[PDB]
Structure 1
Amino acid sequence: NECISVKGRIYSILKQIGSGGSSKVFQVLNEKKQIYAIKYVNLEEADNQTLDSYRNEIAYLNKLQQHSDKIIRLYDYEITDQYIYMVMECGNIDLNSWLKKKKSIDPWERKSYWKNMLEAVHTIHQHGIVHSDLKPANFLIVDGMLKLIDFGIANGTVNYMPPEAIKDMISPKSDVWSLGCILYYMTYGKTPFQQIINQISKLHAIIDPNHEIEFPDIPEKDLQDVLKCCLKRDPKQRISIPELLAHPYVQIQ
């Protein structure tokens, strides 16, 4: 049974949750026996470039705290030349797991989730920030409310990748794609391109105009519409977040 000093105050590890290479996340117990999460990041091989990226991300998250409830809380942090410790709220589970483990989505519970994600992405969008790497993992479930976990600034599938990031061999429109895949999965039970096995076959698909993303008729046609509008390959055509906030799917019934 071991501990961590963050800004001179102490927490006892209870168990490790996340691993991400040069980083670990622990559920911990603070002084007043309350429970928290600590993200830990090793800066041994950190080169100034890599380094500032982290500095930037901290600054922003820390800053964007009092802008949206749908971003994870950051309670305190320590930062030195070798490491960062961040003290964030501890949640129940992340969206991706809940997905893996879950095999039924109350159509109503799906809607709220989407609602949360949009608020979040919007916020970071209203600040020059574009995440560009969104996957169910980047969200956290905390009493049926989702939070965004990171801003995609610092530092394994191609699935949620948009056509345009591929034609790249940067737009807010790129986050809509992803966002919609995450909806798509939630809806047709899986991502739009899981079918395709061959990892290069999937790259071509993601970019070829003549491939039809399949859109199975379903009760909710709002929802059907949305996904159709989020997955429009041309970005200039793709719906925008301000539009998506004002679509029926979120607005009416």
Structure 2
Amino acid sequence: QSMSVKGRIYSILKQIGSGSSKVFQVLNEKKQIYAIKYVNLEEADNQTLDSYRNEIAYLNKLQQHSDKIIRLYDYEITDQYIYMVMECGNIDLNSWLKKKKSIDPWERKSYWKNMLEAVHTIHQHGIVHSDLKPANFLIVDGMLKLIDFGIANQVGTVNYMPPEAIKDISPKSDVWSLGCILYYMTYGKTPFQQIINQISKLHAIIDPNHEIEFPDIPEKDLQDVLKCCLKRDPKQRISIPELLAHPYVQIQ
């Protein structure tokens, strides 16, 4: 199969993702590899169109500010569709962590640093993603990159949801969600993964008398990061600038 984006032809190699949007692995005329995100605007309302346009403008602006944000090379927006030419990753973080038995402490730290940089950048532009999960990150050349910003309208998981989001959102909400991802990378499960029932799980996340277990590991700095991120009171939670100065990210 084939497709045109701003007068340039792309040969389709395979389908990567998919609701009213499909993501494909493609090749250009110069035989280079990209990802084309196709979005169908056929049954999209004005609020939806506006959320999609807002996300595209933020992605395109924030390109320049950090290499930990996915590259957007070009796009074609009409009334019926959106075509976005982006860089191709190797795998998303969720699929990678699910396949992998154990994570090496060096790659985890490297990945954590990238997650902090990408999220820091969005916060500096007034954006709180509000729905961070490992699916929002992409491995590209041993480098973790953020794929989206949470503006445009793993499906609806609550394992990474901060207590304040369950009650109701400041940058501290993204800190909780990032801590849950690092907790998965550390202990092999999210802090409340063991609770099947969604109601009982939402009740545990908000419950202060419900103690999050932090089993002893050889990395005390890593244990401290986790305890700092996973503080139920947003006022008592560590900030991104504070996490970037933490020993876990700096020592050695």
Q: Same fold (TM over 0.5)?
A: yes
Task: Give CA deviations for 1:66-117 in whole Å, capped at 9, x if unaligned.
Answer: 1000000000000011110000011111111110110111111100000000
Structure 2 residues not aligned, in runs of 5+: none
Task: Report the alpha carbon displacement of residue 250 of structure 1 after superposing the two structures with TM.
Answer: 0.5
Q: 2: distance between equivalents of 1:16 and 1:249?
A: 38
Give 3-state SS (helix, strand or coil) of 1:236's partner. Answer: helix
Task: Report the alpha carbon displacement of residue 199 of structure 1 after superposing the two structures with TM.
Answer: 1.0
Query: Counterpart of 1:192?
Result: 191
Query: Counterpart of 1:25?
Result: 23
Give 3-state SS (helix, strand or coil) of 1:86's partner. Answer: strand
Q: 1: distance between equivalents of 2:53 and 2:217?
A: 46
Task: Report the alpha carbon displacement of residue 147 of structure 1 after superposing the two structures with TM.
Answer: 0.5
Give the aligned CA root-mean-square deviation in angstroms. 0.6
Which of residues 106, 109, 112 is equivalent to 2:110?
112
Q: 1: distance between equivalents of 2:129 and 2:79?
A: 26
Task: Report the alpha carbon displacement of residue 44 of structure 1 after superposing the two structures with TM.
Answer: 1.1
Q: 2: distance between equivalents of 1:13 and 1:26?
A: 7
How many aligned residue pairs are there?
250
Query: Counterpart of 2:51?
Result: 53
Task: Report the alpha carbon displacement of residue 151 of structure 1 after superposing the two structures with TM.
Answer: 0.5
**Consecutive aligned runs of 4 or more in structure 1 exceeding 4 Å deviation:** none
State the TM-score, normalized to the length of structure 2. 0.98
Aligned residues: percent identity?
A: 99
Q: 1: distance between equivalents of 2:172 and 2:95?
A: 26
Task: Report the alpha carbon displacement of residue 59 of structure 1 after superposing the two structures with TM.
Answer: 0.5
Q: 1: distance between equivalents of 2:74 and 2:50?
A: 19
Task: Report the alpha carbon displacement of residue 183 of structure 1 after superposing the two structures with TM.
Answer: 0.2
Q: 2: distance between equivalents of 1:131 and 1:26?
A: 24
| Correspondences of 1:240-251 after superposition (within 5 Å) | 240-251=239-250
Task: Report the alpha carbon displacement of residue 163 of structure 1 after superposing the two structures with TM.
Answer: 0.3
Task: Report the alpha carbon displacement of residue 140 of structure 1 after superposing the two structures with TM.
Answer: 0.5
Q: 2: distance between equivalents of 1:201 and 1:54?
A: 34
Q: 2: distance between equivalents of 1:34 and 1:121?
A: 29
Task: Give CA deviations for 1:40-67 in whole Å, capped at 9, x if unaligned.
Answer: 1111111101110111110110011110
Task: Give CA deviations for 1:185-216 in whole Å, capped at 9, x if unaligned.
Answer: 00001100011111110010010000000010
Task: Give CA deviations for 1:157-200 in whole Å, capped at 9, x if unaligned.
Answer: 111000000111x3000000000000000000110001111111
State the TM-score, normalized to the length of structure 1. 0.98
Task: Report the alpha carbon displacement of residue 10 of structure 1 after superposing the two structures with TM.
Answer: 0.7
Give 3-state SS (helix, strand or coil) of 1:159's partner. Answer: coil
Which of residues 135, 140, 143 is equivalent to 1:142?
140
Structure 1 residues not aligned, in runs of 5+: none
